[PDB]
């Protein structure tokens, strides 16, 4: 509340920015200057009308190339060479001239149905310390992932290699999956996120080819963070056994070794791995000396769940009947996804009565339904 | 007259060289558009006044 | 490259009919048993050919496609 | 809050999306050798391969 002041100031400068841009473009982006008028005369002399697309197979070092078009016919093209002969390379999409096919130019920036999967389709709306609690070992993920980007200064004093990589593990409900997306908010480095059940395919050999791509994209952004969600899902998952099986699993692990480091010597990629099965992996990635600090997380204890529950109930309309500390008291060393689930079910009981105030009864009755899921997910009930 | 003369101008339309349905991948602010013709490939080509 | 005429449906066939220019070769007498299934194949084929409207008057959903399966 | 959401899209739309194209400042004349590659046949070649 009274976050008004922010919204006004940001909005007002945006209004002026829209104004300035519109007016700047029209009639005072002068097409009447001689540096614009004389430049386009002799540019279009070789630049089309239709500019037949090619795909660049290889160049020859005489100012030539051999293109294969997507349409069909290959062509032995020259190069107009005001696009700087040494600036293009195989895999690029090229502009050819429609009288005789010469490389007028080169398009840069592409997209594929294979980097569609990687790229983000959201920007997180829950930022840091919505994972609050269990914050006593968040210091080995904010001093090897965030910091060398934030200060290269402190790693200049020591010199040698900076920290690369973390692996997060513990029981589920320690917030790993959102933690990865929250340290990304702070650094402002290109955050790719790829699920590990999409590094398992129902076809063979094309798995390693998908995984090889992922880090080449990332090093192209000079800073990126790659989160592999569930990298224990490439060592338990398979489709059919004649294009999956042991072999498909086996190869992708080996591939990811070269990608994490190997020979390539690519740009800076910070890596975040969340896992909880850390024995289905090669003993060539879970050694220290690649993924530097390994972080253990334990179920939140009595005092920690006090930290967790103030995160979730600030969005709620608390009554004075509500006692937060007795909600904490009963449970004994249990998950923090449970606390998130009880608050969701508390607003569902509040909606069942139809009231947008959340009352104490709704939390305290929803607690028992949550506890019925631990005491009859094992039908033994009280241990036998 | 209306009936006999619609035929002659209509000859032009019938004797046209090709049509070819495309789709815009993307514009460029160089006042050309990247268009993928659907039976054929991609051409970057200049626009008319309507659009 | 313009539309200069139209063509009837009948013409421009993949192949001409075999059922009012030829006559199927196997009769229903050369089928032995599967009598339970024979009550069904005359439900599936024969009744929508002579008249679709029998179904309509009841108001029961027609059968559409015929699937034959088996080893 | 909703006015902010609306104006970001507006700024983006008016700036426009464009396709980056490479250049070279030491080429201010390129139709001293561009014109030779252009307009007649000297030729860009249908690539083939000897089979026998
Ligand atoms: N210890 C915690 N404190 C606060 N919120 C938590 C905690 N653990 C989980 N959550 C919440 O639970 C939701 C999902 O958790 P997330 O997917 O980030 O965790 P995870 O540890 O990878 O595994 P899981 O999803 O199985 O719990 C989010 O709303 C997140 O904020
Ligand atoms: Mg999880």
3-state secondary structure C16-58: CCCCCCCCCCCCCCCCCCCHHHHHHHHHHHHHHHHCCHHHHHH
Biggest CA–CA distance in chain C, Å, is 58
Cα angle value A70/A75/A78 (rounded, 5°): 120
Copy the structure tokens of residue A37. 């008028």
Rounded CA separation A266/A216 (Å)? 8
The ligand minimizing its distance to the Cα of A337 is 1
In sequence order, what are the residues at sequence separation of 6 or more whose Cβ sits closer than 8 angstroms to the Cβ of residue B35? B22, B23, B24, B25, B42, B43, B44, B45
Strand order in the sheet with A224-229: A190-195, A224-229, A269-274, A166-170, A293-297
Which has the closest alpha carbon to A194: A259, A258, A242? A259
Size of interface B-D (CB pairs under 8 A): 14
Cα angle value A19/A24/A30 (rounded, 5°): 160
> End-to-end CA distance of chain B, in Å?
35
Mutate to test the interface with B, among D12, D13, D15, D19 (most CBs of B within 10 A): D19
Residue A309 Cα to ligand 2 midpoint, Å, equals 19
The ligand minimizing its distance to the Cα of A335 is 1
Pairing of strands A166-170, A74-79: unpaired
Contact B29 D21 (CB under 8 A): no
Kindly report the nearest CA distance between residue A56 and chain D, in angstroms: 14
Helix axis angle for D2-15 and A4-25, nearest 10°, is 20
Query: Which residue among A130, A175, A229 has the greatest number of ligand 1 atoms within 8 angstroms of its CB, and so is best to mutate?
Result: A175
Rounded CA separation A376/A4 (Å)? 48
Beta bridge partners of B28: B32
CA-based torsion, A374, A377, A379, A383: positive or negative: negative
Q: DSSP letter for A105, please.
A: E
Pairing of strands A166-170, A269-274: parallel
- A250 close to A210: Cβ distance less than 8 angstroms: no
- Which residues of chain B are within 8 Å of residue D21 when distances are taken between CB atoms? 30
Residue B30 CB-density burial (10 A; 0-12 exposed, 13-18 middle, 19+ buried): middle
A377 three-state secondary structure: coil
C-alpha separations of A115 from A6, A8, A146, A212, B13 in Å: 36, 37, 25, 12, 44
User: Is D19 part of the contact surface with chain B (CB cutoff 8 Å)?
Assistant: yes
C4 three-state secondary structure: coil
Q: DSSP letter for D21, please.
A: B
> End-to-end CA distance of chain D, in Å?
73
Rounded CA separation A65/A79 (Å)? 8
State the Cα torsion C42-C44-C49-C55 to the nearest 10°. 110
- Which residues of chain A are within 8 Å of residue B41 when distances are taken between CB atoms? 52-53, 69-71
Mutate to test the interface with A, among B33, B43, B48 (most CBs of A within 10 A): B43
DSSP readout, chain B? -HHHHHHHHHHHHHT------EEEEEEETTTEEEEEESSS-EEEEE--S--
CA-based torsion, A14, A15, A19, A25: positive or negative: positive
User: Is B16 part of the contact surface with chain C (CB cutoff 8 Å)?
Assistant: yes
Rounded CA separation C35/A17 (Å)? 82
The subunits that touch chain C, with at least 3 C-beta pairs less than 8 Å apart, are: B
- Buried-exposed string A197-208: b where 16+ CB fall within 10 A, e elsewhere: eebbbeebeebb
The ligand minimizing its distance to the Cα of A277 is 2
| Method used to determine the 3D structure | cryo-EM
Residue A229 Cα to ligand 2 midpoint, Å, equals 8
Residue of D nearest to A86 (CA): D24
Rounded CA separation A216/A209 (Å)? 11
Rounded CA separation A280/A277 (Å)? 6
Pocket of ligand 1 contains residue A308 by CB under 6 Å: yes
Nearest by CB: A11 against D3, D14, D45: D3
Query: Which residue among A336, A347, A373 has the greatest number of ligand 1 atoms within 8 angstroms of its CB, and so is best to mutate?
Result: A336
Which has the closest alpha carbon to A183: A142, A211, A137? A142
> End-to-end CA distance of chain A, in Å?
53
Rounded CA separation B25/A52 (Å)? 15
Which has the closest alpha carbon to D7: A8, A60, A369, C4? A8
Touch between chain C and chain D: 3 or more Cβ pairs under 8 Å: no
């Amino acid at each position: 509340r009274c976050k008004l002041k922010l919204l006004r100031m940001e909005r007002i400068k945006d209004h002026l920015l829209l104004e300035e841009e519109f007016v700047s473009n029209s009639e005072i982006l002068k097409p009447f200057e001689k540096k614009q008028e004389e430049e386009k005369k002799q540019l279009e002399e070789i630049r089309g009308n239709p500019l037949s697309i090619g795909t660049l197979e290889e160049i020859i070092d005489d100012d030539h190339a051999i293109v294969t078009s997507p349409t069909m016919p290959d062509y032995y093209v020259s190069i107009l060479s005001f696009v700087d002969k040494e600036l293009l390379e195989p895999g690029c999409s090229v502009l050819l001239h429609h009288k005789t096919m010469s490389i007028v130019g080169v398009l840069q920036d592409d997209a594929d149905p294979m980097v569609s999967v990687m790229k983000m389709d959201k920007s997180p709306t829950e930022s840091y310390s919505d994972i609050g609690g269990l914050e006593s070992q968040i210091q080995e993920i904010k001093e090897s992932v965030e910091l060398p980007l934030t200060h290269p200064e402190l790693y200049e004093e020591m010199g040698i290699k900076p920290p690369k990589g973390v692996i997060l593990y513990g029981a589920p409900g320690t917030g790993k999956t959102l933690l990865a997306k929250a340290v990304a908010n702070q650094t402002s480095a290109t955050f790719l996120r790829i699920v590990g059940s999409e590094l398992i395919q129902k076809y063979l050999g094309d798995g390693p080819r998908l995984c090889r791509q992922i880090f080449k994209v990332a090093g192209e952004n000079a800073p990126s963070i790659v989160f592999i969600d569930e990298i224990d899902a490439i060592g338990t998952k398979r489709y059919d056994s004649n294009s999956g099986g042991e072999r498909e699993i086996q190869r992708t692990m080996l591939e990811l070794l070269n990608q994490l480091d190997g020979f390539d010597d690519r740009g800076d990629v910070k890596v975040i791995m969340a896992t909880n099965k850390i024995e289905t992996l090669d003993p060539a990635l879970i050694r220290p000396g690649r993924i530097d600090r390994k972080i253990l997380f334990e179920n939140p204890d009595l005092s920690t769940k006090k930290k967790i529950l103030g995160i979730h109930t600030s969005k709620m309309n608390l009554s004075e009947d509500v006692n937060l500390e007795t909600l904490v008291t009963t449970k004994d060393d249990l998950s923090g996804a449970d606390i998130q689930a009880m608050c969701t079910e508390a607003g569902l009981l509040a909606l069942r009565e139809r009231r947008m105030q959340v009352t104490a009864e709704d939390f305290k009755q929803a607690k028992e339904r949550v506890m019925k899921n631990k005491v009859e997910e094992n039908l033994e009930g009280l241990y036998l | 007259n209306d009936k006999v003369r619609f035929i002659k101008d209509e000859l032009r339309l019938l004797q046209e060289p090709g049509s070819y349905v495309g789709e815009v991948i993307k514009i460029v602010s160089d006042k050309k558009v990247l268009v993928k013709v659907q039976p054929e490939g991609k051409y970057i080509v200049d626009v008319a006044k309507d659009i | 490259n313009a539309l200069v005429d139209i063509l009837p449906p009948d013409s421009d066939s993949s192949i001409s009919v075999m059922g009012e220019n030829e006559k199927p070769d196997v009769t229903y007498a050369d089928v032995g048993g599967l009598d339970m299934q024979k009550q069904e194949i005359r439900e599936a084929v024969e009744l929508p050919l002579v008249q679709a409207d029998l179904y309509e008057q009841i108001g029961i959903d027609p059968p559409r496609g015929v699937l034959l399966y088996g080893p | 809050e909703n006015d902010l959401k609306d104006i970001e899209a507006r700024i983006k739309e008016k700036a426009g999306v464009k396709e980056s194209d490479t250049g070279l400042a030491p080429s201010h004349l390129w139709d001293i050798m561009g014109d030779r590659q252009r307009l007649g046949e000297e030729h860009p070649l249908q690539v083939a391969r000897c089979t026998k």
